[PDB]
Amino acid sequence: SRDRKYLARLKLPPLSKCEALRESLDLGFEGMCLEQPIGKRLFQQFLRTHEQHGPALQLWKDIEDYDTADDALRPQKAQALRAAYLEPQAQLFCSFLDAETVARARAGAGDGLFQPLLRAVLAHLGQAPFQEFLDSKYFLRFLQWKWLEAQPMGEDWFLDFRVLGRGGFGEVFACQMKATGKLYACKKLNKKRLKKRKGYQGAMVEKKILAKVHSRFIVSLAYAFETKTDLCLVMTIMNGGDIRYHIYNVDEDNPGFQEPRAIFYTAQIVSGLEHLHQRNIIYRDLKPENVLLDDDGNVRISDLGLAVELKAGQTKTKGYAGTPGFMAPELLLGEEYDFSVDYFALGVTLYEMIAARGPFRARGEKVENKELKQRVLEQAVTYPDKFSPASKDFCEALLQKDPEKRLGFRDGSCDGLRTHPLFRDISWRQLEAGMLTPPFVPDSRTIQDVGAFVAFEKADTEFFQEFASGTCPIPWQEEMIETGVFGDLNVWR
Numbered sequence: 001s002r003d004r005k006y007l008a009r010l011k012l013p014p015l016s017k018c019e020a021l022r023e024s025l026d027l028g029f030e031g032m033c034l035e036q037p038i039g040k041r042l043f044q045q046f047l048r049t050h051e052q053h054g055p056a057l058q059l060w061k062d063i064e065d066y067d068t069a070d071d072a073l074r075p076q077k078a079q080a081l082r083a084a085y086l087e088p089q090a091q092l093f094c095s096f097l098d099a100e101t102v103a104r105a106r107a108g109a110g111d112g113l114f115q116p117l118l119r120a121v122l123a124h125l126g127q128a129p130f131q132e133f134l135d136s137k138y139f140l141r142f143l144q145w146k147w148l149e150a151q152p153m154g155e156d157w158f159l160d161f162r163v164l165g166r167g168g169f170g171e172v173f174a175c176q177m178k179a180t181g182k183l184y185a186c187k188k189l190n191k192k193r194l195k196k197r198k199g200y201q202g203a204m205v206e207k208k209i210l211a212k213v214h215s216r217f218i219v220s221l222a223y224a225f226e227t228k229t230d231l232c233l234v235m236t237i238m239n240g241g242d243i244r245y246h247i248y249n250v251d252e253d254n255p256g257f258q259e260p261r262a263i264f265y266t267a268q269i270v271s272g273l274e275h276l277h278q279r280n281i282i283y284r285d286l287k288p289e290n291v292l293l294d295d296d297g298n299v300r301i302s303d304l305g306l307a308v309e310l311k312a313g314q315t316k317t318k319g320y321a322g323t324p325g326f327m328a329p330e331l332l333l334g335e336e337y338d339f340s341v342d343y344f345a346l347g348v349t350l351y352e353m354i355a356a357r358g359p360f361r362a363r364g365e366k367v368e369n370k371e372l373k374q375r376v377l378e379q380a381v382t383y384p385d386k387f388s389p390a391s392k393d394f395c396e397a398l399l400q401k402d403p404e405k406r407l408g409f410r411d412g413s414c415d416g417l418r419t420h421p422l423f424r425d426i427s428w429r430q431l432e433a434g435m436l437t438p439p440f441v442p443d444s445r446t447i448q449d450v451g452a453f454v455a456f457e458k459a460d461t462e463f464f465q466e467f468a469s470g471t472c473p474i475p476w477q478e479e480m481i482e483t484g485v486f487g488d489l490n491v492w493r
């Protein structure tokens, strides 16, 4: 189940020890009470047991419920919400709202009703209620948790029990957090090998990006430490492995996906792309081999070592990186580029899910890289009849050789791409919240042995200590909640 010796080191400290922390933390409302899972829970208990804020809590909860409920149910839920909180003679009536918002909220509909009302409620909650919360026993308890979150939790706390895969710098293991029982993947990078092959920069960029981005469509970093021989990244476990295995290696006679399945994965990859592009990051390594699948049947993107973060007032970059057959014409030509290259590789990826072969070579054909580059620059793609009219069109709109014409990310978003007929039966709102059932669930399917193969300077040592930054806060708080430890220790008397 879990190790009693490591479970017994999760205990709340006496308050005296939490003094210093006050200075080191952001005590802003958005950052503490909305973005940190344990902060939100505690804030919500305060609002629940101080009953004058009761009307504001239940309106908050009923908006989130409306936002993620499915189409047929929404019309009735809107009517309920209006009546409960927005009629003057109602019991849970929200006086604190201003006359305009109150008025505007009681009329019409749309794909985002009550988004202005949700801002008005958070705006209110950030003033008096928040101020009183800081004077309460619940804020003090927040500090106890943030202290425990900061204690050292390195190599000794994880048990490796099986090999999941092999990368360029070492193995990736399935492992267990000893105190809570939770399962993760741990990717190992050999230090001596990283040095001789000049891979520091690629390793650091991947770790920086996986720490700061928080999306259900990209693998999440929970811990980063060092051992005497390796650097380690502990991250979301994806037990189904890569999407490419599933195209070719399961049904040999009849490879490829049915169309509804191919569309669903396409929609999840677009959301992850969007979360990268909103932060000015270019991925540069999208392919079936790097899209992974979990026990429930959802996917995420991985392998971020080829990525580039655009600096202040830079809109394009140069550089020859990627996998032949996935690199767009503008890149092959030596031009400057932006997000365009990611949307071409998305075209190649959908094509292969449906057809079980690439658009520029027959299945099991052998082509030297120089010939494959000429094909991408000049060849028209042909489409066999496994494609519908909609999926043919969508692929043509991404594989388009002129990036000025290609569909993708513009004016802050992928909302133009989302309206394509291909997606007509997909509920974007529900997909983004994690509440569609995937139309395939992983059935019965769950590594050959090989052997293994200069002192360091302070430059190397100091680089290793900077890489090994410790525990990421949002994922740690989730672990504590999911596994039941929050429930057992968050008690008073």
Ligand SMILES: Nc1ncnc2c1ncn2[C@@H]1O[C@H](COP(=O)(O)OP(=O)(O)OP(=O)(O)O)[C@@H](O)[C@H]1O
Pocket: 164, 165, 166, 167, 168, 169, 172, 185, 187, 219, 235, 236, 237, 238, 239, 241, 242, 289, 292, 302, 303, 305
């Ligand atoms: N989060 C994960 N969950 C489960 N398995 C994983 C996970 N991450 C990686 N793996 C397995 O380990 C293999 C190598 O991982 P990864 O792509 O991160 O290596 P890499 O050395 O960065 O690859 P490349 O040299 O292609 O950039 C993957 O193909 C996959 O099978």
Ligand SMILES: [Cl-]
Pocket: 256, 257, 258, 261, 440
């Ligand atoms: Cl299928």
Ligand SMILES: [Mg+2]
Pocket: 303, 304, 305, 306
């Ligand atoms: Mg890599």
